[PDB]
Amino acid sequence: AKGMSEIGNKIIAMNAVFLAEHEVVRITNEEFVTIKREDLKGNFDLEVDIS
Amino acid sequence: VTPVTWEDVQGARQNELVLNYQFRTKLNRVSFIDNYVRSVVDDGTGIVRVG
Amino acid sequence: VTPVTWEDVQGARQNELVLNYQFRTKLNRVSFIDNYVRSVVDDGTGIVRVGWNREIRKEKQEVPVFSLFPIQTQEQADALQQALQLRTDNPRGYEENVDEAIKESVRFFDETGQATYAVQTGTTTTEVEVPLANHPTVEMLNPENIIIDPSCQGDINKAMFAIVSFETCKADLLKEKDRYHNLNKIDWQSSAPVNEPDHATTTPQEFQISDPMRKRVVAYEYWGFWDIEGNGVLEPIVATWIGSTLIRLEKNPYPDGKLPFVLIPYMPVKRDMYGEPDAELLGDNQAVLGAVMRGMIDLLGRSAN
Amino acid sequence: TAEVDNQKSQDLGFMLQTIGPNVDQQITLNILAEIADLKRMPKLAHDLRTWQPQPDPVQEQLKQLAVEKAQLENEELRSKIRLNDAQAQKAMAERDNKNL
Amino acid sequence: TAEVDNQKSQDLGFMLQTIGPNVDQQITLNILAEIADLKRMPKLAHDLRTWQPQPDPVQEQLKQLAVEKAQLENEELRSKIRLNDAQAQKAMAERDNKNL
């Protein structure tokens, strides 16, 4: 379970850098929310676990 | 077919009826399934061609 | 029958009653089912033939003719809409009791909307064709009497031709007045089931009928797709020949546009048409079991008692 | 599969039961329409989504009459109030002929 | 098969029970008509689809009379209001003979 959580955290950090705003809007038809680049070191606001 | 976001409900309903219709009339559903499982079980793997 | 979309409810109800009625009256439902399962179980696969039956006959009748006059008074004008109301609410009741003159009156109303009286003044001997035996037919074909294209790659839909041998009589062929041609050239002594060992049947080899009309003969049908035009497109056709004489050649009349045969395998084979029955796996077990039973009887039977 | 399809219908019924029917007719109709589709009733489902309330003309007149009914009652009090001080003021006038 | 046919009738009953009967008479009648067909009652099913409410003439007159009944009550208040200020204004007139 933790192995998938480790993968999820890395992808979330990548998604906040390598994905443009419009790409997220198309995937999720909601208002886009941004995250500070220097804050990606710590996962303060997110928790990842299997469903 | 199930929608991903709330605005995709119309698309899911339209495609689901069309997709089920093609397998119901244009194809032998029972024969295809019988060959589908038996090919995988006997040979160890199944290969499906789409055209 | 269940509708696919919301506007198909009326169609589903109408077809379901008609389809059930045909199997209830025109066919032996119990006998067909018994032959349906047993053919699949024993032979390993079942083949069903679908064909329509039509035996319309010419008839001469004295049809009446009615003179048409306009509405003289409103007193009889209500009878026009009364038939219309009865026809919409109960079509069967309208046919049985409403007068023919009133039927002509509403008939002209449907064509033009003019309310006209009908008076019977004369009649004539017309020529009509009374329908008779207009119903579909389903039959189970012996696998030895039907040949399918080997190159179908295990799919009846991709087969390009199919040949089925069946018995018939001259009177049976005469049911269609124009479907067959050059029927007089053939002889009724040759091409008999006695002279056709390739066709399997339960008819005794010594059996025959003196009446030429009811003579039993073997016929071949060719169903498949042929390039009937030089353009290079295949078309579904049906051909029939008896005694090396071609008597029928026409396109497929059914709206389906493909072969009328249905294949049902018992245990399907990977990418193949014919299935495997249960007898394939029990060949050795039955032989071994038979040996044990005979040994037990021989021990008891031959022993002094 | 029938297992998930049947269980989905129960969830729709659970949502319909949990949510008060009075919050919105449209929400209730849409949930019922999905249930009809899961039950393979295309004709019934089409009617539910296309259903509209039947307009009652006499009900609107009675509804409108009640609105103006209360307005006249408020004016009735104001009319009566103008009568109350009129009687009191006239009573005050009649004093002068007594305590002259 | 009888298994699916019987289960289909229960679903129709479930839909009828779940949906409030007051939303539409036509929807309720159509569901009942399908149940009758599943029960092999063609005569009963035909009546349900062709059923119509019986018109009551006296009920309409009583219904219409109630509409105009409220209209007269509103006019009654307006008539009474015109009486209220009339009494007050006449009382004002009688003051002048007192405080002259």
From Swiss-Prot, chain C:
<protein>
    <recommendedName>
        <fullName>Probable portal protein</fullName>
    </recommendedName>
</protein>
<comment type="function">
    <text>Forms the portal vertex of the capsid. This portal plays critical roles in head assembly, genome packaging, neck/tail attachment, and genome ejection. The portal protein multimerizes as a single ring-shaped homododecamer arranged around a central channel.</text>
</comment>
<comment type="subunit">
    <text>Homododecamer.</text>
</comment>
